[PDB]
Amino acid sequence: SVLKNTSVIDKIESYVKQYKPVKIDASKQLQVIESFEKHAMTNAKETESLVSKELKD
Amino acid sequence: QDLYLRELKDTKLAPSTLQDAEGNVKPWNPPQKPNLPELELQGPEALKAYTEQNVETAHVAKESEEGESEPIEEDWLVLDDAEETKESH
């Protein structure tokens, strides 16, 4: 209602309407992060076991 | 009085053929009929950014990257640096 001789509000409306799907989100943190984490818990359990037996000794 | 009709016809004749109705220009030589909607159509366009911000360029930026599927090599590199940092503790 503020603009009277807009001549552009339809164009920008359509441009935003066609722009909201910018691209597909990556969400693919499962190729090097997963391997790092797997190694993480594996040798972390190893270290927990060794420090535990060292404490008992 | 005389002014009560004279000034109303003054502000209803020249503004009629000055804008709104958008045809001809009687009172002064320079016409604003093709000036405000055609020449001034690019006025704010010149004032603002053209072809970048007025059109809202759909700049599809590169998606966020990662470790590029780095193998166990970086894992044992991290192991080595952690070990050499903790050796002097």
Swiss-Prot record, chain A:
Coiled-coil intervals: none
Source domain of life: Eukaryota
Subcellular location as annotated: Mitochondrion; Mitochondrion inner membrane
Role this protein plays: Mitochondrial membrane ATP synthase (F(1)F(0) ATP synthase or Complex V) produces ATP from ADP in the presence of a proton gradient across the membrane which is generated by electron transport complexes of the respiratory chain. F-type ATPases consist of two structural domains, F(1) - containing the extramembraneous catalytic core, and F(0) - containing the membrane proton channel, linked together by a central stalk and a peripheral stalk. During catalysis, ATP synthesis in the catalytic domain of F(1) is coupled via a rotary mechanism of the central stalk subunits to proton translocation.
Family: Belongs to the ATPase d subunit family.
Miscellaneous section: Present with 6820 molecules/cell in log phase SD medium.
Subunit structure, interactors included: F-type ATPases have 2 components, CF(1) - the catalytic core - and CF(0) - the membrane proton channel. In yeast, the dimeric form of ATP synthase consists of 17 polypeptides: alpha, beta, gamma, delta, epsilon, 4 (B), 5 (OSCP), 6 (A), 8, 9 (C), d, E (Tim11), f, g, h, i/j and k.
Protein name according to UniProt: ATP synthase subunit d, mitochondrial
Organism field: Saccharomyces cerevisiae (strain ATCC 204508 / S288c)
Curated annotation (Swiss-Prot), chain B:
GO biological process, one term: cristae formation
Parent-protein residues present: 36 to 124 of 124
Lineage summary: Eukaryota, Fungi, Dikarya, Ascomycota, Saccharomycotina
Assembly, per entry: F-type ATPases have 2 components, CF(1) - the catalytic core - and CF(0) - the membrane proton channel. In yeast, the dimeric form of ATP synthase consists of 17 polypeptides: alpha, beta, gamma, delta, epsilon, 4 (B), 5 (OSCP), 6 (A), 8, 9 (C), d, E (Tim11), f, g, h, i/j and k.
Location in the cell: Mitochondrion; Mitochondrion inner membrane
Function of the molecule: Mitochondrial membrane ATP synthase (F(1)F(0) ATP synthase or Complex V) produces ATP from ADP in the presence of a proton gradient across the membrane which is generated by electron transport complexes of the respiratory chain. F-type ATPases consist of two structural domains, F(1) - containing the extramembraneous catalytic core and F(0) - containing the membrane proton channel, linked together by a central stalk and a peripheral stalk. During catalysis, ATP synthesis in the catalytic domain of F(1) is coupled via a rotary mechanism of the central stalk subunits to proton translocation.
Keywords assigned: ATP synthesis, CF(0), Hydrogen ion transport, Ion transport, Membrane, Mitochondrion, Mitochondrion inner membrane, Transit peptide, Transport
Family: Belongs to the ATPase h subunit family.
Disordered: annotated segments: 54-89
Bias type Acidic residues, positions: 65-89
Main location: mitochondrion
GO annotation, cellular component aspect: mitochondrial inner membrane; mitochondrion; proton-transporting ATP synthase complex
Further comment: Present with 6140 molecules/cell in log phase SD medium.
Name the UniProt record assigns to this protein: ATP synthase subunit H, mitochondrial
Ranges in coiled-coil conformation: none
Organism of this sequence: Saccharomyces cerevisiae (strain ATCC 204508 / S288c) (Baker's yeast)
